[model samples]
Target: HHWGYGKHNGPEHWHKDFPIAKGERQSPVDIDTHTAKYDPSLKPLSVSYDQATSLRILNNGHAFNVEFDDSQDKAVLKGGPLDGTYRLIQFHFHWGSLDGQGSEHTVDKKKYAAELHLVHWNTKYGDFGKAVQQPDGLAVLGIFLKVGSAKPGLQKVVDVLDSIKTKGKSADFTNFDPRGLLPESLDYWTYPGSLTTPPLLECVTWIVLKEPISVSSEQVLKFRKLNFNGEGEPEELMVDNWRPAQPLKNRQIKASFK
Candidate 1:
C-alpha cells in the first residue's frame, strides 16, 4: 500500500515508515543509463533452456515469492546488450497500496505505479551471493507497470494474488514459464550499480526495460488488499511498502540499440 507523495510520506520517509526497508539490499532511484559506452570483450557463455526447472513458493510475511530452481543452470544471456551470461535466480516485485504509482524506478523523476525485479546471476561466477560481490556479477531486469489496460502476460501470476493476500500465506505454483512476463521489446537501458538496500554490494548490472506493462484497476486493488501483518496475528493492513531512491554514486549508464 502506498502512502502517497509528500515530504514525510514519499521515498524520503521509507526508513521511518518501515523498519524492514533498512535491512533490504535494493530500493529505489532507478537511473536511466542510455548514454554510456559499451565494451565487446565482456561476452557471456552460451546456455540453453531445459525442462529441469521447478518453482518454489515461500511466504515471506510480505508477499508470495515464486522462485525457479535449477533454472539458473540453463539460463543464458548472450552478447549484444549485456556483457555477461546471467543465470535466472529469482523474481519479485514492489507495489503500492492503491497502485496509482508504487514502483521504485522512476522516469524523469516520475515513479511508475509498480515495479518487478527479475534477478539473475552471472554464470561466470558460481553463487548468487558471491556473484553480487563483483562489479558485474548481478543482473536485474526491471519491468514497470501502468494502471489501465490489463496485461494478458501478467494474468498467470495476478490470478493468484487473492490466495496469498495475507502475509506468510503461500502455495506452490507449478509448470510456470517465466518468458511470459517479458515484454515484447528487447530494448533496455543498462547501468552499473549496487543493490538499493544495505550491504549495498556494488555488483549489479541493471537492465530496465523501456516499455511498460499495463494492469487494470481491479488487479491493482487486489495487491492493496494484502495484509503486511503476519497471519493469525493482529492483521495490520499493508499500505505502502517501498524504498526510496539511492544516489548515483558516480556510475555510468548505457543502453542497447537506442
Candidate 2:
C-alpha cells in the first residue's frame, strides 16, 4: 500500500489502505512521562556504529534516508531491552516545515523540530527483509531534534541534501559515525509498535531516547527543501512526513530509567 503525507493519503486515511493501521500497538505514540512505568531492569544501550559502513544518502520521495551496508555486523545496536544483537540497516529522519513541530513522536504533548529513526533488525532473523514481518524482529532508536546550535556531525548529512533533493536520487556518503546523531542520554521508553510508514508491520521494538539533539534554523531549512518529485516532475516539498501518535491500546510503555 503506497501511502503519503498529503490531503488524500495522510494518517487519517491509513486504515482504508492497510488494516493494520487500525491494529493495536501502533507507533509514534505520545510519551507522557508521568504515566510511563519505570523499570530498573532495563540495560544501558550498547551501540557500535562502524562509521565506514554508511553507504549513501537517498531520497525515495517519501523521505530522505541514509542507507547503510548491513551485509555484515559492521554497525550494531544492542542492550537496552533488546534480547540479542540487531544490525543497523538505515537511519532516517521525519520533520515538519516549522521548528518544534515536525517530529513524529512527542513527550508530554510536546513535539520537536524533527525526529531521527535508527532502524535495526534482529540478527536472529538473518536479514532485514525477513525481520520486518515478525514481532520482536526490529528495534528502532528514535532521537528527538531540537532547534538551537548547528550540529557539526549532522552538517555532512545536511550538505548532501542539494545533491539528493529529487526523489530516487542518491549520492555516495561515507565514514560518518551515526553515534553523532544521538544525545548524551540513553534513557528511553520501550514498546512494541509498527513502522510509521505504510505496510505498517507490527514488528518494531521502539526505543525512543528521552534527550534531544540540536540543529539550527539554517540546518532545519535544508531538509525542507527536499522534493517529493523526480527529475522533471512538479516539485513538492518533503516536509511533514511524520505520522501522528496512535492510540496506546493496552501497551505498557516501560521506561529504561526512573
For each candidate in the order shown, give its overall lDDT on alpha carbons: 0.64, 0.89
lDDT of 2 at 6: 89
Q: What is the C-alpha RMSD of each candidate to the true structure, in Å?
A: 4.9, 1.2
Best by lDDT: 2
Model 1 agreement with the true structure over 184-250: per-residue lDDT tens digits: 6766666665565434566676777778887787776776777766667876555455565665555
lDDT of 2 at 9: 81
Worst lDDT window (10 residues) for model 1? Answer: 43-52
